[PDB]
Amino acid sequence: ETISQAVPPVRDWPAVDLPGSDFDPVLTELMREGPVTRISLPNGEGWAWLVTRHDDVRLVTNDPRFGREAVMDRQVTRLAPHFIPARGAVGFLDPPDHTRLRRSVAAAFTARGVERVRERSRGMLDELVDAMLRAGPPADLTEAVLSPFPIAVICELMGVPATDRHSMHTWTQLILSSSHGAEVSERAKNEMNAYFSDLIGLRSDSAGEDVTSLLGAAVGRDEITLSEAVGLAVLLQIGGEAVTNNSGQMFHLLLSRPELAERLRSEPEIRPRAIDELLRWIPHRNAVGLSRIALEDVEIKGVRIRAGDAVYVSYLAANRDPEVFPDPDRIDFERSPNPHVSFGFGPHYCPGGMLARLESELLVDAVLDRVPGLKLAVAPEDVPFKKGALIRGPEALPVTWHHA
Numbered sequence: 001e002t003i004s005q006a007v008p009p010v011r012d013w014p015a016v017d018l019p020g021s022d023f024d025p026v027l028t029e030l031m032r033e034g035p036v037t038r039i040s041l042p043n044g045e046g047w048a049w050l051v052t053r054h055d056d057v058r059l060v061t062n063d064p065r066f067g068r069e070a071v072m073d074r075q076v077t078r079l080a081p082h083f084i085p086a087r088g089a090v091g092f093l094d095p096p097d098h099t100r101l102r103r104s105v106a107a108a109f110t111a112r113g114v115e116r117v118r119e120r121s122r123g124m125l126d127e128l129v130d131a132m133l134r135a136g137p138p139a140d141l142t143e144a145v146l147s148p149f150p151i152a153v154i155c156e157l158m159g160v161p162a163t164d165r166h167s168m169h170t171w172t173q174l175i176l177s178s179s180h181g182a183e184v185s186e187r188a189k190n191e192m193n194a195y196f197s198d199l200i201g202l203r204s205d206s207a208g209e210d211v212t213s214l215l216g217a218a219v220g221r222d223e224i225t226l227s228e229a230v231g232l233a234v235l236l237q238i239g240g241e242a243v244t245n246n247s248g249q250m251f252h253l254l255l256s257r258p259e260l261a262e263r264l265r266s267e268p269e270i271r272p273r274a275i276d277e278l279l280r281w282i283p284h285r286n287a288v289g290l291s292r293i294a295l296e297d298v299e300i301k302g303v304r305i306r307a308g309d310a311v312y313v314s315y316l317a318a319n320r321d322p323e324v325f326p327d328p329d330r331i332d333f334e335r336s337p338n339p340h341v342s343f344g345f346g347p348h349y350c351p352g353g354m355l356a357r358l359e360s361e362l363l364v365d366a367v368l369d370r371v372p373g374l375k376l377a378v379a380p381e382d383v384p385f386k387k388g389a390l391i392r393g394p395e396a397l398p399v400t401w402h403h404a
């Protein structure tokens with residue numbers, strides 16, 4: 001042989017505030033380099049591998065050779081200045097115990113299960129929209145509806161009293177407050193852990209359809225421990241708010257490209273498919289989330305991922321796979337196979353996938369059908385987006401409509 005340098009150089013991938021829904025140029029680069037790359041994020045230590053292809057992302061995330069529990073044994077390079085989920089949360093559990101914990105609340109998150117809160121949710125959404133209209137045109141869609149709605153729906157499903165909604169949002173906010181290197185988020189986590197630990201105990205260990213009752217009944221029959229239950233209850237509540245940000249990009253885009261909004265207004269039946277196309281395209285987060293550790297050597301596209309090596313997958317990059325999604329950057333409401341991985345893949349796939357689809361469904365409906373001539377009150381570029389955050393999205397969405 002000769003002089004083989006088949007190992008990709010560690011690419012520095014600093015935290016950078018992107019505008020609107022533009023694609024990360026660095027991620028663009030990582031994708032062109034090769035199937036397997038190496039990156040260095042703002043925090044933690046080391047380099048961790050990076051997979052971007054649709055097929056390799058499905059492999060890594062659904063293969064027993066890559067685990068999550070081991071990820072805590074080291075300070076894997078990352079984007080967030082501290083691990084959000086505790087040492088017992090779903091995100092860090094592997095198939096054996098992970099499957100058990102997720103089964104306890106499965107019934108509430110399937111299409112049929114979520115379909116049970118459709119009417120209830122529709123009514124809540126309608127009150128918020130009615131309130132927006134009554135107030136008057138110059139409105140911030142995020143504060144007026146995209147923020148309150150998802151919060152009300154998850155709390156309702158979880159069994160959280162409507163009077164405690166403000167607290168969930170405050171805690172979620174602080175917990176995801178992203179950076180420094182300490183306990184504003186830690187205290188916030190203990191407070192919310194304490195909140196759900198008590199709710200799970202407060203007779204919610206008897207009978208009821210809400211998730212906390214399911215978790216309480218499960219804890220009562222030794223199916224899952226209280227730690228696992230609180231850990232899951234906490235991440236569901238938090239993930240619940242992920243819709244605000246995603247739907248924010250959805251609307252910023254629909255009103256940004258009038259031809260997309262018009263197709264949805266004049267052709268309602270295609271809304272489901274369009275929403276899935278929008279979910280595939282929308283760059284939901286910054287960089288990547290929680291890595292996996294190779295539990296044993298594994299060869300991928302010529303690269304040897306040594307046991308002990310951290311591996312990252314980019315669902316955003318995967319949803320932009322040319323071979324799987326021809327003309328990737330184009331938002332086509334038709335799109336044939338469209339097997340996007342915006343909700344993850346493998347055992348850790350998002351349990352809120354169907355709920356979010358339902359929420360997105362009602363939002364598009366209510367917003368496009370009840371607000372005549374809804375449009376941005378400012379130029380697309382003048383809309384501010386979240387800075388230094390994990391999940392990308394509008395900070396506010398100024399819009400106006402016919403009325404005034």
Ligand code: HEM
Binds near residue numbers: 289315343353357
């Ligand atoms: C359209 C909005 C949403 C998007 C794009 C999204 C996306 C994701 C992604 C990419 C993951 C990680 C998969 C992995 O680790 O491989 C995840 C995990 C998770 N999501 Fe979501 N999510 C959304 C909404 C929600 C909602 C509303 C909830 C609350 C019911 C939720 C709860 C969770 C939980 C609990 C996990 C951790 C699952 C586990 O590790 O077992 N998500 N989500």
Ligand SMILES: O=C1C=C(O)C(=O)c2ccccc21
Binds near residue numbers: 242284288290391
């Ligand atoms: O919205 C998410 C995006 C991720 O990449 C992600 O890893 C995640 C994990 C847990 C809840 C939500 C999310």
Ligand SMILES: O=C1C=C(O)C(=O)c2ccccc21
Binds near residue numbers: 238239242391
């Ligand atoms: O990006 C994320 C990474 C996590 O580990 C995580 O737990 C999370 C939860 C909710 C929204 C985003 C995230």
